[PDB]
Amino acid sequence: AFFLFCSEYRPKIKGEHPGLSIGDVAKKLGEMWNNTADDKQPYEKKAAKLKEKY
């Protein structure tokens, strides 16, 4: 949920207000994503689709 959600919301969250380091940026953003599945499922669905396609 949160992994695919961060890999999806990368553009705006990384080009609007990143933070101190890429580490802390993606950490806080993945936390917010996991605390949003209820609103991030299709990103994980696309991830699993690519995984099956591989």
Partner DNA sequence: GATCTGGCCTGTCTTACACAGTGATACAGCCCTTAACAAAAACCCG
Closest distance to DNA from the beta carbon of 30 (Å):
3
Residues that bind DNA (CB under 7 A): 1-3, 6, 22-24, 26-27, 30-31, 33-34, 37, 44, 48
AA letter at 2: F
Nearest of 11, 13, 35 to residue 24 by alpha carbon: 13
Closest distance to DNA from the beta carbon of 11 (Å):
17
Closest distance to DNA from the beta carbon of 45 (Å):
10
Tell me how far CA of residue 10 lies from CA of 13, 18, 35, in angstroms.
6, 10, 17
